């Protein structure tokens, strides 16, 4: 099921620019996925066997990377899907990679430390042959994180006679050769992304007050650096329990700085943070703003995107919005490269620069084919994947 | 319906009445690891199409694995990963340091130009290559490939190797180029052995008995053969054409295979033997039959209903699986000699043949024997006894 | 002491006797790479406990490097040093192309928990893999090790090694999983083929002169066994017991093998093979004997005080070294058969175990005529003599 | 013998720290030790053999790196004790390795050149699966050089399949892929150290005057940058034999320009460097000074660090104050990974942003855990490589 | 003149008369892969002389590439192009599972002392050691290098090769070090074999007439002694000296090959095998002969003159290529017994010699009973053939 939405984003670019057939039908499905079968002897002294994969979608551009996902939703069509996903990410930002993806069909919930553990080296030692920081780069999803990324590391030393080619697993831990800037990137991505668009689209940042829903990890560190940037956010918006759907509003801009000290303590224009759907069509109709920065992934379906562009409201898709997170993840490859590590002012840096290239390329290409934001970035993204391919020669 | 259950539901029986672990069906239940992959093909008019391959080693327990590579349209993760778990059971039937692997692609081959084939043949290697090897899994021919096929296979799979000439990483290769002798009439020697030992295990003499072969295909071609090379003779046939369906030849004395064969060529046209087709001896088949044994020598041929009377009917049966195993030990003899590079002869073929032949069926008898049951339900039990030796030993479970 | 000086002083004295090169004895006086590693082990009770481990490669002069590992609390680096040099000897003495290695883990396996026992031999592979190899340096079962440790180091080491099964790499496993038939009883099979020998080139006619066996343990037992299956028979055993010591059973005819082996289940209780223990045959123990010939099966059973008289006494003596050797032996057949991955019988083993130990016995006493000394200075000459040639012509001086 | 010690320095580390018992018993011995027998064809034709060690400390943090001795005095437990003070060494800058060291007992002076390459040559040869610029990387100790790190460069390049993995070996010479400001590194280092010190210990530089205690290769640098730092050297104090423990003063500072002049021609608070054991309890209780920055290795005796405390007297530590140059071995080996080779200038610059890094660090310790520096470092070092272990799943 | 234009006029000919596709002449015309390296040496008065290398891989269609290396000063590039199709020849003549290579060094070894030597062949294979390998190009000893330098060949290459002993790089190894039996002996042995297989063929009785061998080389030594081992016996031998030129000893009866080669020692001095030197059997010589058969031992004695009259005066030929081919099937059987590290024993060389000499022997016969032409024009086509279906199979046209 899943895989058709990602097919489409391709055909319907593909269409738009024109590309060769070729394109599409090797664009179409991975290069290659693996499916492994993982045994775990269970803290009780049993088996289980654990279903796992990697898809590599794409390597056209660059060797390949994404996450890997510990969800019991995971199957191989989730995974075929989710790295064709990535190939996308990947692109928008012009990165020298392609798209890659992995999970494990587990609850992890229902296992013990040292059987997560196991079940995380037993994944390794399934695929390693294929993994590697020039081949294929996995990297924390749902449910793994840095503790998986370093056991994963570990084991992949061991079966590569020792090589510590640490960058070939992103979203380590800053103390095992993870980066700065890793926490808060995507947060300082949207912000970044906010100011360029505004000033594209004549709005002068510290000169107009915004919107940001919800306040998870993005969120917060986007409303973080809107002030770093000069800007500030009037209305926030977030969810409880205990009312769930509220809205702070503390006049002149929420002050960030105390604001998040009281999460700790108490746990409790438009950026759509948090949820997917939320803007439909008839959500839409009823807002008042001149723009709309994505950075959770989903927010406005295909419906809600139609009276937008004739309401005459334009939009940065997420995919492009959201992309400082795994732009800090190739940072982490860079540094792990060749063995030296940079600050979070230059982490920072860097970032800007990049997310500014990346914006720049979206916005000439929109100029070029005369089309929104959302259907500019995916052209963006097979555009360079196909220049590659046909060099290659692999049509 | 879906190929594994049947395959799975074999594992699941066997460990039943062998009262192993439950982890040795778990860790059986699936394939070890599968690897999809999309191969393009530049064809000749000047296109791409991708064309999906498929790998899956379903056990490396007791040895590398090893199975045949398909080229049909049916052909799908189902299949690939139903199918090399048959070959853990083909390879440790026979106890061979082996587990099973297959692979395929989803093509029409004959919708495909002789150097659009090649592409395709050498774009799967070209997928897979790091997990092929003379010693992780060894692919060989299946429905659709023959010596051609793995001959481009080789070629590429060296070039990928860094120029090492492991061509023992595919069998079912021609002698001219590190095939074995001994390979076409492999399975019809088989076969032939397995009549010979069940019988006089049956208390049947074989010169002293006549024998029916249903079919007369590659198969029975060379099963009649060594029945006549060990001593016995077949009097009764059986075979298909268009133009009239199932007739059986019967010439008493038996018929000499040497001139029947002869007249093949040109024309075109006690105990059983079915070769051909499955399910033939059907539950109303085997109610009408005549005999003390049959040796399958096609795979199928067992109603699982028709299984059921023959054992209240009184009669014996040599399981497929075993009978007909001789083609896959003659392919394991070519990897051997691919390690060391030194090639036997046909006769130095066939005497090793018969030596393991014979000690595999005296293994399946052993079986049958100590947990009292039938033979297709011993083999199996064979198989799975000493795949789990290995995984406990090895520390899997 | 150090057991490394016993070792070194046997060369030094070989090359003394030979007339070698200085540098012979300078490059053989010690191993080549000995690697120490630090083995974590992660406790049943959550807890870590990190064990001393070692592989000393003695020498690849001749061959890659073979020898065993131990699990005794007593190994250090010294041991395994001497050790693997002693195996270097070991080895050449039947002219194998091998040199000699040797491993440890400083351990009390008896204090560990079958979990954490695989772990240890887990992480003793994964401290070395990269010094190891069916081609480099080729692991085996000594004290406290077994082939179920072996086949916990092959899996491993397999997973180490790019998925390539080149299981090889250790010997001494289980049948079940690539090891070899005629294992349990070589050393004994061994024995009994040198003693004939033995007796035949000193003028003794097998069947026609009886025959004293110290010892009934598994050399015992299956050295017995083969001078029956040779057309001997023993007429005087020996054993101990805890309730009551030093015994020797003495049926005059000779007593079965067949009903005494039978006797020891169910009640687990001319010329001289010593087995069992060390130090047995001291100074004054080889005043009192009555024999022409001594066959040691175990190794020690010499005082360097008792081969004195014995050679004044005339008392010929085969070493153990030699004599015992047939165990090793099979463990390099085992490693044959596992690099083109064929299997050979039992029968197919004893054939090739006789023609090889008749070989390394000829050759022995080839040097023993030529030198004009005793065996066991030959044996000793024999392996430094082909191990010399080797590094002279690979220029190591 | 030589193990204890540094034995100690973790216990000691471990337990005013609080961390895990498992700590110390991983970090207790090396994680491999391998000892060969070198076999020299010798220049009249003979042979000797020669015992070799390389014994990986760890690679917790990283790869393992630190140096080979030619002394005659070098055996296992020596080898076994220097890589551990490599850990520490390493991880006191926090730089992405663990320790190594390896060593030959031999006497060079004994060998013929063509001699002493064979036995380098043969070093290698007897190692190298254990070796490379992501598993293990040596570099020069007491006896060993640029030429000597060329021979085993050679040799490994050929074993190494021709793959030049130069970064195996660091302190080679610039002429073959080593690094500027190699040579005056450390004492760049210690110059650093002094300011950073002083300023956080309320004393300005241009405006006290310093001692510094021999004048070798360290002190001849550590005046130098003192010079360059806008400080500037009254007392000096070396050694001859002939006369022996004398000592320089030329007033208001002694011109370093001019006194470097003149140990070409004629050979002849508080900095010792030179030799160990200088400041002992009954030497300590003789000066005057705010402030000590060991430059050599030892200067302070466990006896001499307790009236400090009680004198009112701080103290830099060796380990850290003299670590510029593996800093700058570091960078070499960063240099060789993506082979683009950095400027005098630009080492320098690098170098004091790291160095003050790794002061910031020490010292954020120290004022947390409420201790001496010298047992601030140690636990730095500790800290960190616990993190690490800890991740990786070592515990 | 460049050698290499007689070599592949051999390839022209044959495929001409084999109506093979015009890729084969195509394909084989030159080497697949040559590397020329500068091999510096530090002379041993302390100075620098960099000699030119080679090693050429002429094929490797049907197999890893075997031919040996050459320390002459008339060596080049052309040399070892030619001499290395030259080996695919040779080899596929036996249809060994080889391809042709060769190498060389331009040096003057008289001019070297024995360490300058010995840096020379290390330095050798540290130039080549990527494209050498027991399953990619398998070099042995040609003019002026021997086991010795192969000893020093085989030591770097395992240095280089990540310590794996992988022997069977380098063939010609000493028995002292993982060599061969029957080594020495092999062409001898070979000849005669032949010598006999052909009189058969062509009507003759080996022990009913009496045979003349042109030299006493290695060759003639080892040929006329096999003569005698296979119930033959030879009368007139011929020799050179210097001191008087080409004489020819005949003791009637035939002379003892035992006390002739005695004689040889201390002294130092029907149908017809010519060894020693090459075109001997002139135009003119081949009218003055009576005999029914020439059995070529060395390599050369034809002038392609010579061969025209031979067929017209009704006078048989067994050409160079095949019958003195017994060297290089025992350097085979040397990297067989590398491969799965078993030693065979001097009769069990034998004993395969025979069989295989045999079976190529009969394959060449076969090609020219049926393309109707000479041994010679057969043997050449008999490589060809056989190189033939294995490029095709491959895909390499």
Chains 1, 4 share one sequence.
């Not at 916005?363 to 070029?368: H, I, K, L, N, P």
Request: aromatic share 10%; charged share 25%; glycine share 10%.
């Amino acid at each position: 099921n899943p895989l058709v939405a990602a097919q489409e984003k391709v055909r319907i670019a593909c269409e738009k620019l024109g590309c060769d057939p070729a394109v599409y039908e090797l664009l179409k499905e991975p290069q290659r996925v693996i499916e492994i079968s993982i045994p775990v002897k269970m803290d009780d002294g049993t088996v289980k066997v654990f279903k796992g994969w990697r898809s590599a979608h794409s390597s056209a551009v660059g060797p390949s990377k994404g996450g890997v996902r510990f969800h019991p939703n995971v199957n191989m069509d989730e995974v075929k899907a989710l790295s064709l996903w990535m190939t996308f990410k990947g692109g928008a930002l012009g990165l020298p990679y392609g798209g890659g993806k992995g999970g494990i069909c587990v609850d992890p919930a229902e296992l013990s430390e040292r059987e997560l553990e196991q079940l995380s080296r037993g994944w390794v030692r399934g695929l390693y042959k294929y993994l590697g920081d020039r081949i294929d780069i996995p990297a924390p999803d749902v449910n793994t994180n840095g503790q998986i990324m370093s056991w994963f590391v570990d084991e992949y030393v061991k079966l590569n006679g020792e090589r510590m080619d640490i960058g070939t697993f992103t979203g380590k831990p800053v103390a095992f050769g993870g980066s700065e800037g890793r926490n808060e990137a995507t947060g300082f991505g949207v912000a970044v992304v906010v100011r360029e668009s505004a000033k594209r689209f004549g709005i002068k940042m510290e000169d107009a007050k915004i919107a940001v829903q919800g306040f998870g990890n993005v969120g917060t560190f986007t409303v973080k650096n809107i002030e770093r940037q000069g800007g500030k956010v009037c209305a926030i918006a977030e969810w409880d329990r205990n009312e769930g759907n509220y809205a702070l509003y503390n006049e002149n801009g929420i002050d960030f700085k105390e604001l998040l000290a009281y999460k700790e303590a108490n746990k409790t224009i438009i950026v759509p943070a948090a949820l997917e759907n939320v803007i439909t069509g008839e959500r839409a109709k009823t807002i008042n703003a001149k723009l709309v920065c994505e950075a959770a992934n989903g927010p406005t379906t295909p419906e809600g995107d139609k009276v937008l562009t004739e309401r005459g409201i334009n939009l940065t898709p997420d995919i492009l919005t959201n992309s400082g997170g795994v732009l800090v993840s190739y940072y982490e490859w860079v540094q792990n490269q060749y063995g030296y590590y940079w600050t979070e002012a230059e982490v920072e840096e860097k970032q800007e620069a990049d997310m500014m290239k990346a914006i720049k390329g979206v916005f000439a290409v929109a100029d070029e084919y005369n089309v929104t934001l959302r259907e500019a970035v995916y052209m963006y993204a097979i555009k360079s994947i196909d220049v590659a391919m046909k060099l290659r020669g692999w049509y």
